[PDB]
Design goal:
The structure is cut from a larger assembly and holds chains A, B, C, D and E. Chain A is about 35% helix and about 20% strand. By secondary structure, chain A is α+β, with helices and mostly antiparallel strands. The longest helix of chain A is centred in the C-terminal third of the chain and has 18 residues. Chain A is globular, with a radius of gyration of 16 Å. Chain C is mainly beta. Chain C starts with 8 loop residues before the first strand and ends in a 6-residue tail after the last strand. Chain E contains 4 helices and 7 strands; from the N terminus they run E-H-H-E-E-H-E-E-E-E-H. In chain E, the strands form 3 sheets. In chain E, strands 1-7-4 form a 3-stranded antiparallel β-sheet. A two-stranded antiparallel ribbon of chain E has the order 2-3. Chain E has a two-stranded antiparallel ribbon with strand order 5-6. In chain E, helix 2 packs antiparallel against helix 3. Classes of the chains: A alpha+beta, B alpha+beta, C mainly beta, D mainly alpha, E alpha+beta. Chains in contact: A-C, A-E, C-D, C-E. The interface between A and C is medium-sized, with 22 and 19 residues. Chain C binds 3 RNA strands through strand 1, strand 2, strand 3, strand 4 and strand 6. Chain B: This is 60S ribosomal protein L32-like protein. Chain B: Belongs to the eukaryotic ribosomal protein eL32 family. Chain B: It comes from Chaetomium thermophilum (strain DSM 1495 / CBS 144.50 / IMI 039719). Chain B: Keywords: Metal-binding, Ribonucleoprotein, Ribosomal protein.
RNA sequence: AAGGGAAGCGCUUGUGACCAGACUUGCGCCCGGCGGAUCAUCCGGUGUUCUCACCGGUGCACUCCGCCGGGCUCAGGCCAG
RNA sequence: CCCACCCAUACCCCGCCCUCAGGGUAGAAACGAUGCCCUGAGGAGUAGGCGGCCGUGGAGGUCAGUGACGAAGCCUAGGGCG
RNA sequence: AACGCGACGAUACUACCCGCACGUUGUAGACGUAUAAGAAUAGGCUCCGGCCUCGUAUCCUAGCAGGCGAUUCCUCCGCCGGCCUCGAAGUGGCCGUCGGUAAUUCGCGUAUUGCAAUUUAGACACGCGCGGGAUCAAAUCCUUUGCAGACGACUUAGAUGUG
């Protein structure tokens, strides 16, 4: 149900119940997803397949830097500096985003929004949040 | 050292004590378990909803028997010669100073056991 | 200004324990799913997570709200009532009480 | 559809006493709040002298020493008859049974807070859906009246006033429906071709 | 020694009596009646009890006690007038007030912090009965004591981040 | 703290109160700074388990012993995915 | 008459205790050999039989045992082993 | 009904009413807790076209747990005032003012809660604080009465009077 470039609904975590795009499928249940950031506020991040739901909608992925994607997918991109930000942060102030993350997010989401604005109301769909409303039965509904 | 030997998990089949029948109604009857010898008594007849009776089935695992939750086996210690007896069992045995050991010999035992790496269960009693 | 909701779980009601005519076994509980009526719809929710969320008197680590976690094991009967195993048996005062059933781990 | 609500308000007219009590008791013990109205409109199958004979046997059963305490208090209101059925159907001598009985409320007629709400019916307990057309049936209100209930006329007159107000409300509702239909037509003569065509395929 | 050991002796005044020839039950009831009050109000109440103006409620030891309207002062119907118990409590209260005066405390603002009535060794008598029996008459003494005092985060990462969010916004 | 015509007892939660453990780092490497000669080998004596050691001498910067300022490996308690 | 469902200490798989039965363990780098390792089966129980462990007062030997920096005793909604 | 209910009088403090700052306060258990015709079922509904197995319906549903700004929109909510309405255990309508408001589109912010950890968020009740208005009460003991009485309990009377 999950392919490179597919909209998923994150169910748990900080961005719970919210739609992003799966870009690359990592190993051991790890998925590299992005909002894109300028669309719904979710940056480049990795989540879990058992906590996402795969939607049948497929986004046109042509025009994205696959070398940039797998360079980010290398297994240090977060943990290498995580300790540095933890030590720096711990009146309250938002700790700064790394320049590498900013640059890769800008390239990736520029390409992705350029592709997304082609089909109608997909930007609004990706910006909107997911919720279950009375009478909605997950065991029957098609995603 | 402080850490003990790697051991299989310590599982306890039953934790609560086996209370003697009618001990909670009669104060001349202590809580220590006694085998009931009646021929119509329901504890012995093993009717449901009554007190349980000790059996060999509740026995603890041989690998984890007589072991504290820390993973050591307690050894009663009266002096420095006893802790030197426990010398070669840092990872398996622990020292428990006897209740009638004076404070000065307790200090000596604690010092020697610290040099030996042997854990003392009651080193902070008179502190 | 949104004006929407935030429910990501399915409502459930803890009804009772698995039991016979006399004996009750607190190891497993019976959960009624909101909107599930048959065994196939239950099989959709087999394996899904479940939380009993309650409130206490003392705040221990920033919250007064405590949780008990578990998962759905198998269907129960023909009504779609599910059998659930928790980390600890439910308080038995939560008979007929609310539980939140989470769609993770998901397979759809 | 196996849905959980705040309070389920059941209009008891045309419902069989035992089956409605069964459904209500199961919901109560499952944890749902139930409010039943028109217990005087509730129905009991069989024939009316059968029901009256059963109630007279109930009246015969009575404590000797002091009727004041301990004796079976023969409640003669239809709301209390339905409550008696539910109480016999629920384990009332326990904390959980007490909680379910506290979740239950039963009334004669439709009080003002509940005449403005939606009253649902239970298909498994409907007299029209259950009884064979040739069989006889009685009414709990008539049984209560001939056993000693004192307020048949009061509830009848209150029901008459409630029906008058309901007729006025339904006149307003029909006006609203006609205006809404005219508005939908007038708007559909506008909107945007694409939009209407698409909403169609989807299903709305 | 006194049971209440949590009160400092430099700020309180204490009185004691041992082996007193009074009824333990009546003394307990009247001590509980005068418990927790001001010294002057307790003295006035006890003198009223002697004068049969006010009565102490019979709460625990209340076998076949007749009713009296004065009992409504206590939310009870059964009240009684233990004159001798009242007299001995007045004696102990005056002794304690003298001790407080000696220590220099303000007698107008003193409350009865602690009061306790215990049983003393019983004192035998014997009387003569028919059918060859002799009835024992153990009198039931009690010890009394009284003391008066002056009246007067290991949050998790998610929690820390969410609180940072609400602090910023 | 509990208490609508008994209490008391077993299995299993939950609340409140009060607590025993565990953990605080150990091991080994890449370095650098040190403080130093209990490295090797050989020679004499001694004791033994006849080939093994201890003493005394010889042996001093990529050899041996302890500390420090770092970096890395592994193993470490509780609950989980 | 048909279908599905509920559960007993029963039936099947796994773990743990104990008992019994069957094997291994010396030119000893060798053992609370009254020990240890492998394999299987079995577990209600009155009268009765056998075995092992727990506790009390006193005696011989030993622990170059404990103790006024506190023995024994007693109390304890404080803990550990069985 | 001594653990069924209503009406009214007076209610000193405590805090009686009013607004919020809330509360490490409680709850047999919020998470859109949305939805009034009546009556019949061998008939019914309707705008009078027609429709009715089917509530697998209608409403509602997008925005840092929902920001700031802008073209466009008079749509939908909320609060207070006036007129009226609701008594079966007491509410809703209209108008007005004021506040908020994607139906279309766009820019800037989300990052770090590190791969999930209840998304601590609702309601009513109760309690601590303020600052605005208002008032300055009773019952019991005691004495007395005999329409009452085993004792309680009850009818009575004590403040200036036909005491």
């Amino acid at each position: 149900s999950l392919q490179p470039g597919t909209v998923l609904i994150l169910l748990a975590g900080r961005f719970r119940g919210k739609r992003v795009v799966l870009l690359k499928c990592l190993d051991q249940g790890v998925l590299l997803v992005t909002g894109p950031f300028k669309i719904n506020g979710v940056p480049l991040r990795r989540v879990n397949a058992r906590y996402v739901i795969a939607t049948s909608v497929k986004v046109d992925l042509t025009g994205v830097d696959q070398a940039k994607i797998d360079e980010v997918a290398q297994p240090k991109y977060f943990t290498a500096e995580k300790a540095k930000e933890k030590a720096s942060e711990e009146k309250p102030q938002k700790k700064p985003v790394s320049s590498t993350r900013a640059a890769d997010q800008k390239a990736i989401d520029k390409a992705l929004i350029a592709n997304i604005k082609k089909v109608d109301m997909l930007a609004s769909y990706l910006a909107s949040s997911f919720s279950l409303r009375k009478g909605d039965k997950p065991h029957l509904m098609k995603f | 050292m402080v850490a003990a030997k790697k051991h299989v998990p310590i599982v306890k089949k039953r934790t609560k004590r086996f209370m003697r029948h009618q001990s909670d109604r009669f104060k001349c009857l202590d809580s220590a378990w006694r085998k009931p010898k009646g021929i119509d008594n329901r504890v012995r007849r093993r009717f449901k909803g009554n007190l349980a009776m000790p059996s060999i089935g509740y026995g603890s695992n041989k690998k984890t028997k007589h072991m504290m939750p820390s993973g050591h086996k307690a050894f009663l210690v009266h002096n420095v010669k006893d802790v030197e007896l426990l010398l070669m069992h840092n990872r398996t045995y622990a020292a428990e100073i006897a209740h009638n050991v004076s404070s000065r010999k307790r200090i000596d035992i604690i010092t020697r056991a610290k040099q030996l790496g042997v854990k003392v269960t009651n080193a902070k009693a008179k502190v | 200004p949104s004006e929407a909701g935030h429910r990501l779980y399915v409502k459930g009601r803890h009804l009772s324990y698995q039991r016979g005519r006399r004996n009750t076994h607190p190891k497993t509980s019976l959960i009624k799913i909101e909107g599930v009526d048959d065994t196939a719809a239950a099989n959709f929710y087999l394996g899904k997570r479940v939380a009993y969320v309650y409130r206490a008197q003392k705040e221990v680590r920033g919250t007064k709200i405590r949780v008990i976690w578990g998962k759905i094991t198998r269907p129960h009967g023909n009504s779609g009532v599910v059998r659930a195993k928790f980390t600890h048996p439910l308080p038995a005062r939560s008979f007929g009480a609310s539980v939140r059933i989470m769609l993770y781990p998901s397979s759809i | 559809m196996s849905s959980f609500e705040s309070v389920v308000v059941i209009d008891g007219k045309g419902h069989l006493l035992g089956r409605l009590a069964s459904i209500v008791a199961k919901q109560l013990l499952s944890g749902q709040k139930i409010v039943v109205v028109r217990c005087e409109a509730l129905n009991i199958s069989g024939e009316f002298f059968r029901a009256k004979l059963k109630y007279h046997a109930y009246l015969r059963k009575m404590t000797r020493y002091n009727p004041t305490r301990g004796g079976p208090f023969h409640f003669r209101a239809p709301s209390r008859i339905f409550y008696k059925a539910v109480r016999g159907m629920i384990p009332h001598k326990t904390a959980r049974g007490a909680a379910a009985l506290e979740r239950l409320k039963v009334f004669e007629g439709v009080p003002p807070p509940y005449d403005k709400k939606k009253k649902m019916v239970v298909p498994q307990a409907l007299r029209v859906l259950r009884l064979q057309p040739g069989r006889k049936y009685c009414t709990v209100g008539r049984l209560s009246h001939e056993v000693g209930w004192k307020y048949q006329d009061v509830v009848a007159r209150l029901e008459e006033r409630r029906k008058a107000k309901g007729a006025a409300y339904y006149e307003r509702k029909k006006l609203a429906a006609r205006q809404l239909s005219e508005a939908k037509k007038a708007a559909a003569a506008k909107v945007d071709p694409k939009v209407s065509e698409a909403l169609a395929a989807y299903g709305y | 020694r006194y049971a209440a050991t949590e009160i400092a002796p430099t700020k309180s005044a204490r009185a004691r009596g041992s082996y007193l020839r009074v009824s333990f039950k009546n003394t307990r009831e009247t001590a509980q009646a005068i418990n927790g009050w001001k010294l002057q109000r307790a003295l006035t109440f006890l003198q009223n009890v002697i004068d049969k103006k006010e009565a102490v409620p019979m709460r625990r030891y209340a076998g076949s006690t007749g009713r009296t309207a004065q009992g409504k002062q206590w939310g009870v119907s059964r009240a009684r007038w233990p004159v001798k118990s009242a007299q001995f409590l007045i004696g102990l209260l005056k002794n304690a007030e003298a001790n407080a005066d000696a220590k220099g405390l303000d007698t107008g603002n003193l409350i009865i912090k602690h009061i306790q009535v215990n049983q003393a060794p019983k004192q035998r008598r014997r009387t003569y009965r028919a059918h060859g029996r002799i009835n024992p008459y153990m009198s039931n003494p009690c010890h009394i004591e009284l003391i008066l005092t002056e009246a007067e985060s290991h949050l998790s990462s998610r929690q820390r981040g969410v609180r940072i969010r609400r602090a910023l916004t």
